[PDB]
Amino acid sequence: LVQSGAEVKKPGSSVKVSCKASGNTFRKYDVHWVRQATGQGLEWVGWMSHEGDKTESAQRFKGRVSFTRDNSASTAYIELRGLTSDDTAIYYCTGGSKHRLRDYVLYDDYGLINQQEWNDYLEFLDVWGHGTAVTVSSASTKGPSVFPLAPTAALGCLVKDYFPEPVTVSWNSGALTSGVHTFPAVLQSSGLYSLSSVVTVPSSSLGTQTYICNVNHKPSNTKVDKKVEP
Amino acid sequence: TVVTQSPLSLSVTPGEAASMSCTSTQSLRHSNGANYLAWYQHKPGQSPRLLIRLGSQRASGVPDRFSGSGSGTHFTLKISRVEADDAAIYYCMQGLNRPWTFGKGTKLEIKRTVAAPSVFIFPPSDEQLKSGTASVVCLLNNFYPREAKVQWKVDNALQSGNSQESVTEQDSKDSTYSLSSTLTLSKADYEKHKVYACEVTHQGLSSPVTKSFNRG
């Protein structure tokens, strides 16, 4: 499925995230939302039934979320509020298979149904989306500063103080997919990120060979081709 | 109703069995004899994939090495003849009681022979030093297992609480890890000291490995 793109929000604002289905996947399937924070795992958030008669959330989100759909049937929308930095995660919309079952029934003297209760049971979540990352922070957009790392040897680039994520780091414009290592970024006390990318080459080639790391921070239109020599 | 996975992490030599377990407090078996516990895999930077539904049934594409099992409160995912492609975090999810809850997850990593890291040290660039900040980086390269400790030392003084490290996900080819630690310092305090060392400790080494440099 095709979700909307990454969003950045100040603590206490609201986010609305989109999801789109292929044809009528949203009436053969129920619509859910799962997230995953930094040190967290998969966490169900809420759901909304294709029949349209049930909308429920996880406990933590009661009072904060609102799950609506476009009544052209095409688009799903989640809205989250009271935003903490804990609500910084990748948000996945997905389909679901529920079993609507009758668990209780009671018939009257006339044979009619006097009492009944139907319940939904989750069988599986399938056809997932690509995840819409939400960053709840105080900082603003910031192009990174790229610094050289210089001394069989090692060398690389240092991508310093950017916001938000992500940042890609290619080497030799894609010619080098060997001996490279690009690490997870770390979140600094500045509220900004810093990532490192290196490559391991033999020193006999340091004078002969060229090594240009390609850095692209799309949120702030910062693209840098930095050449690394000792 | 809480469901808990065990163990937290798995170490499997490729081509071996891997057995996990999801255990729930209340029972997950609906009165129709259907257990509502699904299994999912999640490889990093990717969307999670369903592999086992209704306790034992497999979804479209899941090889028969992944076998769902169990009933009631005791379920079990089993990966037989694991490959490097199967290192991931596997999540069980109950679907009987509201609210529906995911599991804590069980991480699977490839067991390997012990590999020591190759250590490198990078002084701050002169480019960076004009900004008032200095960033020294220590590189840990292609080691296994993941457990490793770096100790920053400035003029033979153990630094603690001022650095920041980060490890890569397990490599698909050699099943190793790599760590990057960044000691940060002011341009003023960088210039008060001469020796910057990086003492790496890993079970692949006989003794700890220190990689140093001197200002100038």
Numbering used by the authors:
A (entry chain H): 4 to 52, 52A, 52B, 52C, 53 to 65, 68 to 82, 82A, 82B, ...
B (entry chain L): 2 to 27, 27A, 27B, 27C, 27D, 27E, 28 to 212
Quote the authors verbatim:
Some of the most potent bnAbs target a quaternary epitope at the apex of the surface HIV envelope (Env) trimer. In this manner, the trimer apex forms an immunogenic, structurally conserved motif consisting of an electropositive hole surrounded by N-linked glycans. Apex bnAbs discovered so far can be grouped according to their heavy chain (HC) complementarity determining region (CDR) 3 topology: (1) PG9-like with—or predicted to have—a hammerhead motif (Doria-Rose et al., 2015, Doria-Rose et al., 2014, Gorman et al., 2016, McLellan et al., 2011, Pancera et al., 2013); or (2) PGT145-like with a long, anti-parallel β-hairpin (McLellan et al., 2011, Sok et al., 2014). The elongated HCDR3 conformation of this PGT145-class bnAbs results in a paratope that projects a long distance away from the surface of the Fab and enables epitope recognition at the C3 axis of the trimer apex via a long-range interaction (Sok et al., 2014).
Here, we solved X-ray structures of unliganded PGT143 and PGT144 Fabs, and they too exhibit the β-hairpin HCDR3 motif as expected. Structural examination revealed that HCDR3 makes extensive intra- and inter-CDR contacts in PGT145-family Fabs. In our four Fab structures, Y32LCDR1 hydrogen bonded with the π-nitrogen of conserved H98HCDR3. We found a 52aH-D/E-X-D/Q53 motif in HCDR2 that appeared to stabilize the HCDR3 stalk. PGT143-PGT145 and PGDM1400 all contained extensive electrostatic interactions between the HCDR2 and 3, such as the interaction between R99HCDR3 with D53HCDR2 (Q53 in PGDM1403-6) and D100rHCDR3. The HCDR3 stalk is structurally conserved across the PGT145 family yet primarily interacts with a single glycan at N160. The stalk, stabilized by tertiary and quaternary interactions with the other CDR loops, serves as a platform to insert the somewhat variable tip of the β-hairpin into the glycan-shielded trimer apex. Therefore the structural and sequence analysis reveals that the evolution of these types of antibodies is driven by somatic hypermutation in which substitutions stabilize an extended HCDR, thereby reducing the entropy for binding antigen.
